[PDB]
Amino acid sequence: SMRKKIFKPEELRQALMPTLEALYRQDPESLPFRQPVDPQLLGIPDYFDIVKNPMDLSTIKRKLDTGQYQEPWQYVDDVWLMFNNAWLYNRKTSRVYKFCSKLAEVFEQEIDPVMQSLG
Ligand SMILES: Cn1cc(C(=O)Nc2cccc(C(=O)O)c2)ccc1=O
Numbered sequence: 001s002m003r004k005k006i007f008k009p010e011e012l013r014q015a016l017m018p019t020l021e022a023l024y025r026q027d028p029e030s031l032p033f034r035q036p037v038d039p040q041l042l043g044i045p046d047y048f049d050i051v052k053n054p055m056d057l058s059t060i061k062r063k064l065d066t067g068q069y070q071e072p073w074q075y076v077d078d079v080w081l082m083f084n085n086a087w088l089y090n091r092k093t094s095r096v097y098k099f100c101s102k103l104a105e106v107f108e109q110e111i112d113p114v115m116q117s118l119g
Helices: 007-026 057-065 074-088 095-117
Strands: none
Touching: 007 057, 007 074, 007 095, 057 074, 074 095
């Protein structure tokens, strides 16, 4: 069958970290994504009922820093999970939803040349 895990996790860390840094540079749009959603703090007790697999920038960063991503698409999947969770949970008219859309646009712009560099 197909080859798997051809890149070292540390090669993926080096190649992909600039795309994550681009998200962190978005001010104010990254602020709601820097830390895990806290439903008690935010007064949204249904959050974990709706969002079964939460994700945020700090979790992605720690996974990439520590070499937990073994394939480039696993990193992409977690970034998309973060955005899809926020689009699912929040009203389309909301500030967090709009900020999510901004981060997603930045991510798409940054990820395509990096994925090409892994080709
Ligand atoms: C991803 N996400 C985030 C929030 C949120 O408001 N988080 C938060 C937590 C601390 C600070 C800040 C800040 O904007 O300063 C934001 C609410 C729903 C949601 O889906």
